[PDB]
Amino acid sequence: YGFLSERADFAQACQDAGVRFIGPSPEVVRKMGDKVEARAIAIAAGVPVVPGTDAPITSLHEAHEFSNTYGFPIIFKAAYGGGGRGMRVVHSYEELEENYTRAYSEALAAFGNGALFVEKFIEKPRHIEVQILGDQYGNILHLYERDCSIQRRHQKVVEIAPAAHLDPQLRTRLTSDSVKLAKQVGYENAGTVEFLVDRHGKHYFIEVNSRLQVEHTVTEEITDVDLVHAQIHVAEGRSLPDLGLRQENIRINGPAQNRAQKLLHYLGHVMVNGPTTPIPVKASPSPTDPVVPAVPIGPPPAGFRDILLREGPEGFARAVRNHPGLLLMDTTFRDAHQSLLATRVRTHDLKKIAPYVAHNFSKLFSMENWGGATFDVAMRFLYECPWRRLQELRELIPNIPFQMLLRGANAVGYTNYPDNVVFKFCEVAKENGMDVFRVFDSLNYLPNMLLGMEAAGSAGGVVEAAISYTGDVADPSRTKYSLQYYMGLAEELVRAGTHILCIKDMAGLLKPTACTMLVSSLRDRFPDLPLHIHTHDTSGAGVAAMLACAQAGADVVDVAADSMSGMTSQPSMGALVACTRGTPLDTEVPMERVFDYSEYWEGARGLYAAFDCTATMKSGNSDVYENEIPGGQYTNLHFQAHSMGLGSKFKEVKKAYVEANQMLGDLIKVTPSSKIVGDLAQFMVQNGLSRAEAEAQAEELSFPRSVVEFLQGYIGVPHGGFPEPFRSKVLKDLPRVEGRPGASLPPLDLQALEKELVDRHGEEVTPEDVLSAAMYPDVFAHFKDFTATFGPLDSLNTRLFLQGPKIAEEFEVELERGKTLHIKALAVSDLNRAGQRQVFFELNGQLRSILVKDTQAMKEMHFHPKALKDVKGQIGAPMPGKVIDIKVVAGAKVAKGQPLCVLSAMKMETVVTSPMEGTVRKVHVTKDMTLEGDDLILEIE
Amino acid sequence: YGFLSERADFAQACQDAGVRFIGPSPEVVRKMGDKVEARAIAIAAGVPVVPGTDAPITSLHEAHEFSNTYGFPIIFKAAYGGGGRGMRVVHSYEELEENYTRAYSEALAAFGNGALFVEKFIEKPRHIEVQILGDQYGNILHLYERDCSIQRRHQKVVEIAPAAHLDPQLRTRLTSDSVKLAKQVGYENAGTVEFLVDRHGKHYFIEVNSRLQVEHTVTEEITDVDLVHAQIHVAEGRSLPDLGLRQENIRINGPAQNRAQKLLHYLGHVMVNGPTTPIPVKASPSPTDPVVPAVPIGPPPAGFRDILLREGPEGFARAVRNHPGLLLMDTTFRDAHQSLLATRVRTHDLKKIAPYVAHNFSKLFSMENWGGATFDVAMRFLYECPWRRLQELRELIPNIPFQMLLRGANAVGYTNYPDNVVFKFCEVAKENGMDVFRVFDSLNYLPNMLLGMEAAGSAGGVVEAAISYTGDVADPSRTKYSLQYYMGLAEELVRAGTHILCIKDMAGLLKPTACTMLVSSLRDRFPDLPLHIHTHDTSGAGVAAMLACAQAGADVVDVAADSMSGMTSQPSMGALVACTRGTPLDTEVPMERVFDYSEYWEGARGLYAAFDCTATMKSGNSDVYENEIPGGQYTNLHFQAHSMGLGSKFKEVKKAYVEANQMLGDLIKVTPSSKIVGDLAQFMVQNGLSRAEAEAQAEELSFPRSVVEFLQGYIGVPHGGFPEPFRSKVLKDLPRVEGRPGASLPPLDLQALEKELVDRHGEEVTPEDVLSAAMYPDVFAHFKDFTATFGPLDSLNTRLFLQGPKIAEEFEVELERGKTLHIKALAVSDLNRAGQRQVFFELNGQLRSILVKDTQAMKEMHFHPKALKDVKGQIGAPMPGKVIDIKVVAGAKVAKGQPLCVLSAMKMETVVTSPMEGTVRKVHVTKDMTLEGDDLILEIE
Numbered sequence A, B: 001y002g003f004l005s006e007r008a009d010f011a012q013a014c015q016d017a018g019v020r021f022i023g024p025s026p027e028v029v030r031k032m033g034d035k036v037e038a039r040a041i042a043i044a045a046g047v048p049v050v051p052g053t054d055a056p057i058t059s060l061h062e063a064h065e066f067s068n069t070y071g072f073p074i075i076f077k078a079a080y081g082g083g084g085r086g087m088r089v090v091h092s093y094e095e096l097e098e099n100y101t102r103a104y105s106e107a108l109a110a111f112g113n114g115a116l117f118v119e120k121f122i123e124k125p126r127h128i129e130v131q132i133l134g135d136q137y138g139n140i141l142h143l144y145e146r147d148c149s150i151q152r153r154h155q156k157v158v159e160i161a162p163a164a165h166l167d168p169q170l171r172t173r174l175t176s177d178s179v180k181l182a183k184q185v186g187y188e189n190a191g192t193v194e195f196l197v198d199r200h201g202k203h204y205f206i207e208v209n210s211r212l213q214v215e216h217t218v219t220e221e222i223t224d225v226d227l228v229h230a231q232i233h234v235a236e237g238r239s240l241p242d243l244g245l246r247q248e249n250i251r252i253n254g255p256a257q258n259r260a261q262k263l264l265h266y267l268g269h270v271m272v273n274g275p276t277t278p279i280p281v282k283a284s285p286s287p288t289d290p291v292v293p294a295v296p297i298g299p300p301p302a303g304f305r306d307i308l309l310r311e312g313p314e315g316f317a318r319a320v321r322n323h324p325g326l327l328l329m330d331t332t333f334r335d336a337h338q339s340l341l342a343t344r345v346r347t348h349d350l351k352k353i354a355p356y357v358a359h360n361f362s363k364l365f366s367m368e369n370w371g372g373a374t375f376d377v378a379m380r381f382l383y384e385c386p387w388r389r390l391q392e393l394r395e396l397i398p399n400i401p402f403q404m405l406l407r408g409a410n411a412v413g414y415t416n417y418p419d420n421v422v423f424k425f426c427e428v429a430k431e432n433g434m435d436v437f438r439v440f441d442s443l444n445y446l447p448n449m450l451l452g453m454e455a456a457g458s459a460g461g462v463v464e465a466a467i468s469y470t471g472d473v474a475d476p477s478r479t480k481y482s483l484q485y486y487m488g489l490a491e492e493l494v495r496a497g498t499h500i501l502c503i504k505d506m507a508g509l510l511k512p513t514a515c516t517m518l519v520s521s522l523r524d525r526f527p528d529l530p531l532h533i534h535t536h537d538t539s540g541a542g543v544a545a546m547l548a549c550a551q552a553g554a555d556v557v558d559v560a561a562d563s564m565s566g567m568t569s570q571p572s573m574g575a576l577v578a579c580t581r582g583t584p585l586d587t588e589v590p591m592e593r594v595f596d597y598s599e600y601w602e603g604a605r606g607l608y609a610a611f612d613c614t615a616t617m618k619s620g621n622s623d624v625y626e627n628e629i630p631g632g633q634y635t636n637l638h639f640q641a642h643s644m645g646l647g648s649k650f651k652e653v654k655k656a657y658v659e660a661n662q663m664l665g666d667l668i669k670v671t672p673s674s675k676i677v678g679d680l681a682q683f684m685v686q687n688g689l690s691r692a693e694a695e696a697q698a699e700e701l702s703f704p705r706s707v708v709e710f711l712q713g714y715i716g717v718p719h720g721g722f723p724e725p726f727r728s729k730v731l732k733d734l735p736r737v738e739g740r741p742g743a744s745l746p747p748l749d750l751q752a753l754e755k756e757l758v759d760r761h762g763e764e765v766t767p768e769d770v771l772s773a774a775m776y777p778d779v780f781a782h783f784k785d786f787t788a789t790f791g792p793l794d795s796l797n798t799r800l801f802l803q804g805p806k807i808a809e810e811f812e813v814e815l816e817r818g819k820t821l822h823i824k825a826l827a828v829s830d831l832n833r834a835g836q837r838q839v840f841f842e843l844n845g846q847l848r849s850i851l852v853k854d855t856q857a858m859k860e861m862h863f864h865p866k867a868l869k870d871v872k873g874q875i876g877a878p879m880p881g882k883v884i885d886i887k888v889v890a891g892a893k894v895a896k897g898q899p900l901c902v903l904s905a906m907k908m909e910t911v912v913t914s915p916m917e918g919t920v921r922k923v924h925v926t927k928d929m930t931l932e933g934d935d936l937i938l939e940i941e
């Protein structure tokens, strides 16, 4: 083969040497090997041809005239070319010049002749070809047409004989026209007249293969005619009739999943580029995986979930109130790590210990495992589905109620949503096995809590209304958040139909005396209502606070596994179990089971050393009674301060946090209000501002977006109202939200969103995907693109996820039950000319290689811009950030306070505003430019 | 396969996992995989079985009772064993106990269970087996019996279907009994009931293979039933009738060359272990290949070889004498590099310039390209065939006579050979295209020269008798090698029928006055004889010496290409051509052609920088008139002195060379006599001996083997005889050779040697291989083993041969005309657990990997031994070397001068002898031990 039948000079050289060529005559090989001559012969034989130029085109102008006459699409083809090279389809006039030039250069390089011709492009043709056989006596026998339509880039891959579902009349036309064409040239060998068949059943001649084709074999199998025997005997001078070959005697006789490669691509990416998750501290994960304790064979014992499923939320609440002793709940699944390892704990590690929890802790009130930061963090930083985590944990723990932290009018998100999104989220959360909804508001703003309670109750969930605790009820000088404030809010939440009343001490402010006073007052007022107390051990007094709550008549307290307790986490489970043992408050939890649970979590916490709060805080700190910083905010505020170069000033940041809380009006501090106070505190320290200076200059200063959105009312109304005149000075003419922010939002069309997601990602979009996109559109889009590239990263152990494999390291990855990948990392190559490294693996005893991309290998940048602090017209970047939008151009008049650009840094759009009226002289920045602090954005005159 | 159908626990584990096992049920696999259970079922089905025990035998007594009942021969078989292991035939009672014990131990070791059973041994059975197929509906279709009787140690080798010449009634019994057996167990897959058929046509069941056998293919080819399709469809639950399978429808129908991998293995070896050729200096080969000058298209012009081929040796000699002008000859092909790069120039580089030489230097008298050191060095260090070099150069240069340096009674070797080897060497050299034989002796010993002249003349070669020049014929104080000595030897060589007379000045001692005197005296005596003068430019006077010879009536002078001339090489070709231009001695060689030739060789010499004499000698040196060290010996003696730690004492070595020459009797100094003087000079300097001390202590000292063999007479007799009493003192009672050393050697049987080589290396042994083995047995053996491992290394360029490729380096290797390898080196791995590195290549766009061996990666040793110089009984190693042989043991009495051990260092067996009479107290060395200088060999008391 090798397209040698195109050439005749070899056939002639055989004849001149006195050696027979077993094929057509040199004249027939020449006539049929020239596509222009062969086409002219086909027209003369009355065989239909594709509409096309009669000669090779010499100019782009002839291609333009052809395109005007026949319309697009058209195809350029090399006049002297075979095998699919030097061919270009053109769909439009804009493409014509580029594709002509490329087709010409490719034809010149491949065939030594750049001559092109133009044809009409037949869209979605069948490639049908007819086997012919001729003798030296002018007998021509055709053979049944084959189907060669299964092609990759115009190369044949699979060939079928006869053509499947071909119209018998079309078959007769194809075979008759092949025999006519062959007779017209005096053809004398096995050969193949090729056609394109359009969707309307018209056939068009394209080319004749004068060489026994690769696919002759399927014709032999359906005709019982040995083509190579026939070729030899014809070259001996035998006639087709003498071979028994007559036309009347010839009859017809009879998305791939790539999960393993995507995982190897992730592992190769981490080996070349480092961790894909941002690492805050230079600590390495443990090299040893945690030891999983032994679990009994069988279903776990019946728990409080069996009561909830049998008797509903009110039956569950009565069973909790009637329980003899103290009930505990496990927050290790979410709250404990959110505080200690910043919610980085992966579904992989949670699943390993889940069967042990189900068997040995079946008497837990609930396990807190989802809501708070876990929803965003799972998608954004762990690249895993939070819903799959819920479903898989629910299968492994069938007997313990699952609890989530729900914001009342915001669900698990950072902004307000239309009510129908919050309702649909609670419905789908309950369907996926969520049982208890701890409904809180960041300001205790009752209208937001009532919506979340109604949404959770309408879903059929246990409504736990949570009052966020701030201040000190035992301090008579703190009048704003008095005992009467808490009692009055509890009365409104009980009237709203809460099944359980929670006190949420998010910072660890509840002193044992305040515990006794608050919990006894609530118990005396509500004798039949279950009381749930949540605290943090930030002060090192959380165990004593929870014992005081239990003695004052709390039915439930929040605890964590001992190795996941203390500091900014919950009180120790083992400490509470040991201290209540043999009292009327005994939890009946065996201490040995708490130890085995803690040992697993000690090993697992070692995998997260890169995120551990102990890198920055070695113990609990009693300054929390002054600063009131929540556990998860303390860790985040420290990492942010270090990233901004304020790490040495963190004591000033804590002092500014107290001042910022007062300036803002001493509001409750929990996500997102704790972040708003944090951003203001960092802003004050960064700019060297005292409270009095920041309040005096409030009309001139560009406050953090979170502070502005709070003052606008986007998170609800704080107790006692907003601080005036401070709010009016910061907002100026900015729009204000009155009442509940979600109440003015139009309902989101979830069916329109589902359709958009199906169009973008394919038919596997679920209701969980729609709700994830509705709450977190950019995060969900990034998560889908990332998992489309790298596959199911939840299958990797946490060390391999964070650091990848070492060279010569061998490990196992379970994709599904009974599908293990044995993977060994072998080598990483040097950088190629495309800026890629080749990573080599063994996968199930076989060499694999993946091309990866090393940005670190080739990284450089330059920052021009500086703003003179003394020149009011020079606008510097107020933070390191990326330019999202530029609102002004050079020569534009700008008013004082007018938006100039939008920076996106630390996951917060900051609008940079004009400090003066003037004319923009020059803009120094571009869209997507990265700026450092004080980089010159623009000049104003 | 692997006898896995014996096991059912896998079939059960598939069923328990919900995965279909494509085979019989786990119960059928168990029943049929147990030979005792399967046999009991065969008896119950009425199928004949071999007479045998009903249970596994527990005692030798049960084997005795069985043997009494059934008679011998019997066979022990493992009860739980397959594949012919744990089986023993017993022919007699004397064999019963041994064979039982062996069969039991083999069964226990192979299968974990020693249980045996006894059967009657069927003598000379046919092994006939029947293919069965069953479905889940109880349909069983048998297929025709196969013949598996062609066995080696009970393993099947050749299988036939149907069984050849099988009785049709026996076939029907076999197939009926297989179908009965299969029905009795409810069999459900393709399977094989096996039988032994005796010489009387009785069949006996042995075993059923429940796994699609290796030999199923011959059954498919005779039945047109795809067994694997049938196995799959039966496992889908289809019936045999629904598959069209009914018994009535089933009928009977009737060394690879690895050159590219071996080259990649060499390149990988050099990348891991470094150069395979010993590198004397820390210089790197040039990264640039030499530019080959343009060659005319066509055959080269007629030269002096066309005269030689037309008119024979005497016609050639007359044409040389009658030539108007000075003829030149090119030593560059051999002598020039032997002196400068120590003969490391490869066939690869010689071939590249050969066509240019043929066209532009067609008037050369000859080109010297083979003999001297080139024969051994090509095989030993370049791993290339010297004969292939001769043949390929002869094809490329058809028109210039080829010249070799031939030792008269030793050919190109280092020892004397039987005469028939020297004659056969000259014959095969002439057949391979050698034209001129420069016959010399290292001592001008006429009887050795006459044999070499007769051998070369009898082959039909041009005999050039060469007188080796030493001394100064212009110095009347040097009486030993006077003008009369040279004239008298010339008369004897002319009387012996030399065609050409050569003066070989191997050191560059011929001063212009001595040239004039010697050459004019020879010309006056022999007016019609061609005179050829060879010198070296070691003194920097060689050009002036050759001009004086040409003026005195020399017809030919030796020259080298300018970049390969001077120093220890020949005089410059360009200098001689330029100095004779426009005189009666004009060479008619165009200077531009000499420049292009020199430029190629300048580039090529850069590839050999690692061997260049300029590492040690920056110019010619006139001290050669005092030391008389030949060019090639100077370079070698310096490298040896540096390897022995005497490099800083090389001036003392040159002085000791003069003293050693005198002590030995002032013999001519050329290979091997120049080495003998060199070894003595190094020995004197190493031991701090003056001439007078070495002559006084000659009975006590252990001289170098080369000096001893010289004094014995193994190289011939020196002019003036051996030095007495020095010879008698060194030799003592050692055997003396009188006369010509080859004359007492029995003829070598070359046909016996050819047969030995064919038995060792296969049928590709040539007459050239036989002669190479006859002259250099150990070198030739090593060369064949090396080229068997690494392939045709002559195809590699010289840089890649010496240093291998760099990582990411791409290069071409031409194996044959039109067969190019594109090779890229990609990576080298770390050391594996087997002490190997994996080297990765791209070969013709494809990844290749080779496992190589890094001795350097894992190299360590320890030397205990030291000999106190003051303790006469402590025998130290006289040189660094390897222990070849140990001649004595502890407790042996030894006489003074008795051989103690043989050391092999610097390619020279040195016998270590006792300095005293005594008893060997202790031997400290082992065979193959490597010793340093002064390492304690043994103690004598």
Ligand SMILES: O=CCCCC[C@@H]1SC[C@@H]2NC(=O)N[C@@H]21
Residues within 6 Å of the ligand: A372, A373, A632, A633, A636, A670, A671, A672, A674, A675, A906, A907
């Ligand atoms: O880096 C960006 C923020 C990542 C999430 C931080 C969570 S949101 C829930 C909790 N409350 C806070 O103020 N921060 C953490």
Ligand SMILES: O=CCCCC[C@@H]1SC[C@@H]2NC(=O)N[C@@H]21
Residues within 6 Å of the ligand: B372, B373, B632, B633, B636, B670, B671, B672, B674, B675, B906, B907
């Ligand atoms: O390394 C061992 C010796 C290698 C060959 C040396 C050659 S033999 C021809 C010539 N004459 C000498 O004395 N040495 C060189």
